[PDB]
Design a protein around this nucleic acid. Structure first.
Lengths: 88, 88
DNA sequence: GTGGAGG
DNA sequence: CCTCCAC
DNA sequence: GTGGAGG
DNA sequence: CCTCCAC
């Protein structure tokens, strides 16, 4: 249902974890994200929060920013959504 | 050194607290913030995070968005900065 | 609705 | 003097 | 560096 | 078939 990568991120405060620690974000996507400016998981969380946690908006932003796909954005989203329900 | 309002916010996860719960943000500023879209403390945290926690950038964004002043932006900023060091 | 900082 | 938050 | 989903 | 993440 959820990747191990997911749980690891949802398990504890991201603090300074890199964006690549985000579920759905690997070396390729992660790389581009950093270049676009979002060079830290928390920065992506900021964008998530800014888009008021809206799934479509966020996932669509991701797809437009680093080029994630259906599974990628879905996982990254659900990942943050859960982290927030856990610590925010 | 820090207002009571501050501590209350830095004490626990903002969760769903309204923007008016933010140190430095009262009924006047808070109101405008909501209208500009940021209708929830966490949304402001998202903007803070997006601006990678930069003091000037954030405080300047605040001043430009709701019209906070020197003390207002300073407190709102220090407020979030601490919350993050405490839960992010 | 007083007190006090910011402007 | 007026604004706006903290209490 | 294999396995498997997304495109 | 190629891309890109999860492991």
């Amino acid at each position: 249902t959820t990747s191990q990568k997911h749980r690891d991120f949802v398990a504890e405060p991201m603090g300074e974890k890199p964006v690549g620690s985000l579920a759905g974000i690997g070396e390729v996507l992660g790389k581009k994200l950093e270049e676009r400016g979002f060079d830290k998981a928390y920065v992506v969380l900021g964008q998530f929060l800014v888009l008021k946690k809206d799934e479509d908006l966020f996932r669509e932003w991701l797809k437009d920013t680093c080029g994630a796909n259906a599974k990628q954005s879905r996982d990254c989203f659900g990942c943050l959504r859960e982290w927030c329900d856990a610590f925010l």
